[PDB]
Write a protein that binds this DNA or RNA. Structure first.
Ligand SMILES: [Mn+2]
Lengths: 612, 161, 612, 161
DNA sequence: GCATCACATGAACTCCGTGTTCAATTCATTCTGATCTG
DNA sequence: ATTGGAGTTCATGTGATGC
DNA sequence: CAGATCAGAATGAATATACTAAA
């Protein structure tokens, strides 16, 4: 008899593709009763029987077990709650989408149920959570035949899905239970540490009560991987090595040094041997010279953070007095509000008039006058934050108006706003290579051709050097003098967010695409800061937190411990014990260590007495 | 024996000593030239071989080395990498190799970047020098025309971590 | 002992204000049982008895009008039966307010009632609704004296409201049942036409799925405005200009460009002959010199329509967003009532006091202090309409408490007020006319003498240009080169939001608060999509549907039916006709139109299929 | 006398064919200057205008017109205004007139401001060009002292359309 | 066929600063491909 | 024209059932 | 025979029934 069978997935494009493969007639479309991702239907034959194929793809994934118990409360709750005293059940979260209409559609009745969601552990979790809701509302399970059918497609592949259509079956069990068990473990641990950081870490400090410590199973190891580099920097262990130096003779007027293309070597004798091979120079060769063209980019609109950074640099003086000047300036009033977080320059702003009010102070001069003349180019597009328009001067002043450091600051803003409109600084980066012995040394230099914004901010200007005498390949260009040198430094180069990414997959904690959101979480929690050059230097709160961790309880850091718990909750596939013991023994050993951690809040309290 | 033993030895340059031959698996009337090396590719040359290298390589009196020879590796390091970190692109990779014959070890520096030996290779991997090799003062230069990798294990631990 | 008098205001804020003046500081305030509007009680006198006054504020429309729920099933009957076979009832709008139950629970025993709603239209509905709600509530009219009193206050000022409670009146049912008529007629027309259209056009054309087709008294004209604009834009025949240009120098390094009195000629060979007669010369003589000065007009008070216009044009904000931001600023207590029409300031309004409060914001500290010296100039004698006072800032606010849309909309609100009471800008225009051959050429220029409101509103400032050098009669300036120019007739651009307001207010399509809603309505239904520059571009679906009305029956789209229906209902408002019978006459003629539209719809389908 | 009347009309500018003069008249009877002027003004110029222009008018060889002459204007358009906005006041009014003689149509541009003839001028109206006529490039320039429209009625072929 | 009753449910009344993960469509930007000539 | 939100319990519409 | 000169893929902001009108 003409029955009905419903199929569940989660992607609209994948839904369209599977409809296309299922009928090749595009089915027919019903407007999404769920409010999104309209559904399709056909008159097909699943097992050769006449069945209305009604197919849908859910718009998301209901999640958030959370608590489902008011016993969550706040500070006035039993601490044992965060250890084990929590009646745990899942909620129909994010109803801002709906999922009530999803349940209604899954209701009514279907002869058979086909599940085609994501082919992973999370997808199986969604599949089972959908299953335990669709079975209570389906018509009936009459007969010994099963009503659940799962495909085995790997990704978007026509032949793979074609054979997976025949490759039917029942979804494997306990993977969803593994993953959701991992989620409740994250719930309990994070809630526990947040509750007791709100209890003890704030310590009624007044100033630090506003700040929040957002602990997680991976947040602390990520902070540790942000801070250990600073720790090795404090180690400050220097190094020793050698540098080969040589000179290719000029026209007897100028000088032409080289750079030893095999840059740097850590030895005592191999460098001496190379010197032995490079101490009888008689002739050189011009094997290759290169001359490219790359343009330095115009600056952006100034932020409060950038202003503070350059003012601590540049003229150079502390943030507190910088903010003091900011205010006095807003007062005699020469600048807009000094708490900007945008780089948009909204179109309402009168660029022409603003640039027009500066017709004095010969420091900016006929240069800005001709910039007023002809055409001005559009500034760089930035980001809209909705705080207030960026920093910009009004009704410019002179030497005798402000004076001192306030005048210096105003000079900075004035120069930067002049720079905000200009042409890019073009230059030719030339390099010529000299071939001697088993070596192919190379020297490089830059020659500016268009100053542009270089005319307004010398402190950001390309350095001046003599242009290298470009010549044809294979010229003689003999040698002058050669030398063996030494140079060394600190442990350099506090690495950046790219190296954070690399080490983050290296240790192996995180998920497919949540690395940026963890980074954003750990930075808004005021543990690290963003510095120029994409630097990720930590802050006082982060460093004291990691130091307090290390001093007494490194187990909670143990950057391999998260991978260890992950692998022991991955080994729970196949025949094994119950989740109850696995969670309970682990959490109870952590909570005993954590009880005497609370008994030893000392370490952190001395860290506070030291640094706050 | 005699001529066939000499030919088998000289074919590969694996100058195994008599004591090493009698200690290892060399079954008479079983194989002569082929299976001996086939199983020797995983044997301790340091103990089974003689010092066909000169007496004073590191002194610098010897200038040039000729003839096909096969040796093992003991300590291979990038001479242009710091002690804490060994892998980086901050400088061209110049490999320093502690190169073992059995009695008189030496060391070779790699000129041409070769993608056959990595910094993680297990010690004892067979490397065959083939051609003219020049030592400067106490270190021998390398090139792709000289070195050919064969692979093997020195029957040791991981000697790491 | 004492009696009780109940009074309700239309708006909560005006309610507290009335309480402030009435009780002269004897407030007894407490929030009512709704969470929306509080209740203020005090003691006083009324017709010579010491009594107690309780006053509340209905939060808007007490009730709205809708048909029977059965006919709201969208499939019970054909919409034609809606004309004269659909009984219609009234329901309490916004049940979340629970206004009907609030007025039911509060009001028992209130023997006398005085009513303080707005005296214009659209308030009589509310007053009679409140009356009919409260009549079954009080303690019965045992006393022969009537208890229903109406307060007729003209302007919201202290002396005016003093006269208001000095003398009261009685409402006007005859003109209440005119706005009643207009509301009901609009309701039936919409609920018939829109329903029939959305049922038909989506019947067979599948692309019209998941969309709503609308028709009515205001939506159709506000679409047709942009439609006619697009039709004129498309139907255009480009042509070419011919202008002669003259170039001269005065003394040295000075370039002057003359202008032809005959600004353009539309013929190639005639322009060539004009050039032929012109080029054979080398001298130019001054004939007429001018030293005439003019003045620029300072703006009126910021009306609601003008505020929306400037917010759209300059700030790049949609009308709905602007209205919402204004509402937020109003409810936070910064600026006084957003939706107002009156222009003239109250005579007894303390203009000086408002300017005094806003004197510490750095952006104006120099200009506000100077203006306070000579005394505020009298505001322009504009127009009055008996509505609420115009928009003005009420108390100072630094940027800290304000954000984005804040220093945006609020910044214009204040700058408009300082300019309102400021002086005018004096500028000098000098025109010097030269003789080139038999023809006449002249140059025009302007200069600043004493800026008025231009020192506070930068965008409405006189442009700066080089002043013409002084000239004396009888000199012959050296003549440079000439050059004829070929130009083209620029077609009109897409309609801007500012021009739509002009086309709205002048024809009176909507009310003060209806304009932002309708513009949001037409944009939301995918009829017209906004683009860069806040211009409105009609969609393909919009263009095809509207054109059919033009060729079928223009009596449903021309921007005059709204004026006609409004002018034909005011006769009922003055009681010049019969309320019952006029509705039938209006219903009867529209009934014929609905049948014709059904009959004359086939041709529109032919127009529809061209697009799809 | 006939030639005296012809000379009088010549001094008034009027140049007509003989066949024109006995065609315009209601009867070949006694005539006076006023009645013949009005009766010819009633008639169309196409059949009554004789060869009184020296031709070559379109080209630039012609330079000026002397003496009293008689012409007509057939169509008038404002070359100083666009076509879509036919009644725009963005510019001072400056017309061009299609001036006919019964033989050729030339262009007379209005060089001086004038009000006695407007855009809605009855077409075919009679004009006199006594004295000085400035023909610059073969095209005529109007003036307020010589170009004088005398009025007239002709069969209205235009009906404004 | 009809009066009844208990159950679901919507609404009126009253009392009281958590990890993880996405997340369902198509901008203007931003870092990857074809072609004469010293 | 533009307002606090959550849990409880009670009145009511209605579907299921018995007479 | 690839700079100077014009063209594609990754990055990344985007919303969806209820009817009209109007406080
Ligand atoms: Mn109102």
């Amino acid at each position: 008899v003409m029955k009905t069978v419903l199929m569940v997935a989660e992607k609209p494009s994948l839904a369209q593709s599977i409809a296309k493969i299922l009928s090749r007639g595009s089915l027919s479309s019903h407007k999404g009763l769920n409010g999104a991702c309209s559904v399709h239907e056909y008159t097909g034959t699943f097992a050769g029987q006449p069945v209305r194929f009604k197919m849908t793809s859910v718009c998301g994934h209901v999640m958030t077990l959370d608590f489902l118990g008011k016993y969550n409360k706040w500070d006035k709750v039993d601490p044992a709650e965060l250890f084990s005293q929590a009646p745990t059940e899942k909620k129909e979260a994010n109803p801002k989408l709906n999922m009530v209409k999803f349940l209604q559609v899954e209701g009514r009745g279907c002869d058979y149920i086909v599940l085609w969601l994501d082919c992973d552990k999370e997808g199986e979790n969604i599949c089972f959570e959908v299953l335990d809701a669709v079975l209570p509302v389906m018509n009936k399970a009459h007969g010994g035949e099963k009503t659940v059918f799962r495909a085995r497609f790997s990704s978007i592949t026509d032949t793979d899905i074609c054979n997976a259509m025949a490759c039917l079956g029942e979804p494997d069990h306990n993977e969803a239970l593994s993953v959701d068990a991992r989620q409740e473990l994250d719930l309990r641990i994070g809630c526990a540490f947040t509750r007791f950081q709100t209890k003890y870490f704030q310590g009624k400090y007044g100033d630090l009560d506003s700040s929040l410590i957002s602990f997680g199973p991976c947040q602390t190891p990520t902070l540790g991987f942000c801070v250990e580099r600073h720790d090795k920097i404090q180690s400050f262990k220097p190094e020793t090595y050698w540098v080969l130096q040589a000179k290719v003779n000029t026209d007897k007027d100028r000088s032409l040094l080289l750079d030893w293309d095999r840059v740097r070597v850590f030895d005592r004798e191999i460098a001496q041997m190379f010197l032995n091979m490079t101490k009888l120079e008689k002739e050189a060769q011009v094997e290759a010279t290169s001359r490219k063209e790359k343009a330095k980019q115009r600056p952006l609109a100034l932020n409060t953070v950038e202003m503070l950074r350059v003012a601590s640099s540049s003229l150079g003086m502390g943030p507190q007095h910088a903010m003091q000047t900011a205010e006095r300036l807003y007062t005699q009033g020469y600048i807009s509000y000094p708490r900007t977080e945008t780089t948009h320059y909204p179109e309402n702003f009168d660029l022409k008039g603003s640039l027009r009010q500066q017709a004095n102070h010969p420091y900016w001069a006929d240069t800005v006058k001709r910039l007023l003349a002809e055409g001005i180019n559009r500034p760089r597009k930035g980001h809209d934050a909705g705080d207030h328009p960026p920093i910009t001067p009004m009704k410019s002043a002179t030497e005798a108006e402000l004076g001192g450091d306030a005048w210096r600051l105003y000079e900075y803003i004035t120069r930067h706003f002049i720079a905000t409109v200009s042409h890019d600084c073009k230059y030719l980066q030339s390099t010529i290579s000299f071939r001697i012995g088993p070596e192919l040394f190379t020297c490089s230099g830059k020659t500016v051709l268009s100053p542009g914004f270089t005319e307004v901010m010398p402190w950001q200007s390309v350095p001046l050097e003599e242009s290298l005498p470009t010549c044809q390949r294979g010229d003689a260009f003999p040698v002058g003098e050669v030398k063996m040198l030494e140079k060394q430094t600190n442990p350099p180069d506090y690495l950046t967010e790219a190296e954070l990414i690399t080490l983050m997959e290296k240790h192996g904690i995180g998920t497919d695409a949540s690395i940026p959101v963890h980074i954003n979480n750990i930075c808004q929690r005021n543990y690290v800061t963003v510095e120029s050059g994409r630097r990720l230097k930590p802050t006082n709160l982060g460093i004291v937190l990691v130091h307090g961790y290390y001093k007494i309880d490194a187990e909670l850091v143990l950057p391999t411990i998260r991978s260890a718990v992950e692998k022991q909750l991955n080994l729970i596939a196949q025949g094994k014990a119950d989740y109850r013991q696995v969670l309970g023994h682990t959490l109870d050993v952590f909570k005993r260590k954590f009880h005497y951690f609370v008994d030893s809040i000392a370490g952190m309290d001395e860290l506070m007495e030291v640094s706050f | 024996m005699a001529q066939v033993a000499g030919a088998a030895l000289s074919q590969a340059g694996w100058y195994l000593s008599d004591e090493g031959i009698e200690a290892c698996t060399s079954s008479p009337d079983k194989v002569n030239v082929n299976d001996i090396i086939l199983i020797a590719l995983n044997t301790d040359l340091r103990t089974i071989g003689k010092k066909f290298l000169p007496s004073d390589i590191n002194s610098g009196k010897v200038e040039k080395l000729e003839g096909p020879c096969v040796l093992q590796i003991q300590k291979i390091r990038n001479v242009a990498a710091p002690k804490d970190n060994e892998e980086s692109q901050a400088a061209p990779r110049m490999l320093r190799l502690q190169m073992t014959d059995g009695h008189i070890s030496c060391t070779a520096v790699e000129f041409s970047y070769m993608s056959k030996i990595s910094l993680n290779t297990p010690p004892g991997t067979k490397v065959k020098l083939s051609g003219i090799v020049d030592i400067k003062n106490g270190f021998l230069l390398l090139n792709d025309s000289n070195t050919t990798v064969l692979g093997g294990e020195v029957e040791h631990l991981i000697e790491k971590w």
